[PDB]
Amino acid sequence: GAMNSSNYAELFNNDIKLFVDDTNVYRVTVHKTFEGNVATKAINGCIFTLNPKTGHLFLKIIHTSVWAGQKRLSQLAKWKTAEEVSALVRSLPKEEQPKQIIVTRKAMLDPLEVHMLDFPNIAIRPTELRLPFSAAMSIDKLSDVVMKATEPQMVLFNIYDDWLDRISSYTAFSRLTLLLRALKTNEESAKMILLSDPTITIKSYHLWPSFTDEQWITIESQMRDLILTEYGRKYNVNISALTQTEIKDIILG
């Protein structure tokens, strides 16, 4: 069924699974026309398909040419997502195919189920966590490859860099959600936190900086404070009065 907090450890078990997020597939800028009407201009997008146990990020770039001459693009985009995920599954060896695919938005359930009819044993499931994968386009290297694409293209990244050499995937997924949530809530400030020390760099083959274990603790604390600071600004709440239990609940969920 649906994936929620009652089963976080299922994410990191040895059954292959993928999260699919379609929030950046169909992207537009809205602008005025010479006559004063409004029109949209599509820009390149991407499907975010992630194995949460291994960090594998299969980033299918959606080039604006796929929308040419098509109607009802927001609806088409769900079916295009499902078509591309189905094609990825078929392209993988049997032993690498997922046993479950978890969609971040319930509107993806029927499109994906229909495209996966040839795979009756692959469970298609929704989830109840509000996951910030939309902020994937706030990661500079992913945004760059998407915007530069001149044709459909699939690109691979480890979204965990080399973190699994030192931490478990549960902690890595927790770290990723805190980072992405921070980038979604205040992108400028989150990037300042991540990049304000010139001596800590991003390896050519990585997405995030090469922090030591102690530096990651500091970074994670600064991301929580940012999330808490934006919370207080949004809701006109004085954050000084908040207890540790109150702060944990706000950031979690």
Partner: protein, 300 residues
């Protein structure tokens, strides 16, 4: 006009014949139903007074033999039987008529209701849905499950309706996933009409038989089948015009006959609202929309 005599009525029971019904008391001198119109299928159905869980009955066509009802005290139900001795049967019927021991099928001359509900229903098709080849009539009851229900458990006692499943390989062509899911015309016209049913008359006959089993027996799987066959048409952008006009007539008479107090259990809100207000055919069912809005405006 034909006759279904009863040997007797040893248990108190509500007897249905098509859309009509009447109460028989325990050991009342009741000996059957006369003046049954030739040319249509009919259904004779039962609900026992002391146990309303017993809802069951028999589809039959008097052109295919001489049928009678006899209570079986071992199996505890009224059973349809065929009499092969024609002179014996005529002799029995004449004595019962002479003694006025039979109710008359109470049809009004203006009234085309039964024709309108059974226009496309044939006994030969009923006997393929309800498999019991040694009899020329077909038993149905409230509890019988459909082949589809059993996939998701005695096979000999199933309703073999045509399986319709919108998220199935049968319904969706590879390479046309979005097209076929959002516009079911392929599945309706090529898979179902051309391929399985052969023509719209056979499709409508199964739809009408499913509705009647839903209403007369409180059969849930039949109700599912009726709604699925409606939704398949309404969710197709391309349907022959004569089929849409006939569907409108079929549904109008079904909604007209439904007991107002069973509407909450025989009508699926999602399907009807989708069909009448969102589907491709939302503006093609004028008579059905009018009766639904005036009779059951709450469901919508």
């Amino acid at each position: 006009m034909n006759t279904v005599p009863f040997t007797s009525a040893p248990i108190e029971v509500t007897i249905g014949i098509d859309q009509y019904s009447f109460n028989v008391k325990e050991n009342q001198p009741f000996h059957g139903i006369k003046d049954i119109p030739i040319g249509h299928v009919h259904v004779i159905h039962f609900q026992h007074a002391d146990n309303s869980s017993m809802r069951y009955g028999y589809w039959f066509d008097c052109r295919m033999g001489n049928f009678y009802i006899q209570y079986d005290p071992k199996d505890g139900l009224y059973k349809m039987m065929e009499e092969r001795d024609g002179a014996k049967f005529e002799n029995i019927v004449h004595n019962f008529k002479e003694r006025q021991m039979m109710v008359s099928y109470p049809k009004i001359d203006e009234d085309d209701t039964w024709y309108n509900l059974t226009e496309f229903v044939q006994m030969d098709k009923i006997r393929k849905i309800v498999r019991k080849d040694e009899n020329q009539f077909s038993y149905v009851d409230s509890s019988m499950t459909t082949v589809q229900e059993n996939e998701l458990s005695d096979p000999a006692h199933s309703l073999n309706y045509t399986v319709i499943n919108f998220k199935s390989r049968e319904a969706i062509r590879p390479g046309h996933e979005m097209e076929d899911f959002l516009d079911k015309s392929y599945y309706l016209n090529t898979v179902m009409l051309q391929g399985i049913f052969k023509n719209s008359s056979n499709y409508f006959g199964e739809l009408q038989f499913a509705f009647l089993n839903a209403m007369f027996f409180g059969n849930y799987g039949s109700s599912l089948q009726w709604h699925a066959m409606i939704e398949l048409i309404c969710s197709s952008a391309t349907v022959p015009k004569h089929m849409l006009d006939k569907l409108d007539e079929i549904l109008y008479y079904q909604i007209k006959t439904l007991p107002e107090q069973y509407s909450d259990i025989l009508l699926n809100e999602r399907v009807w609202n989708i069909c009448l207000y969102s589907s491709f055919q939302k503006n093609s069912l004028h008579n059905t929309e009018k009766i639904m809005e005036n009779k059951y405006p709450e469901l919508l």
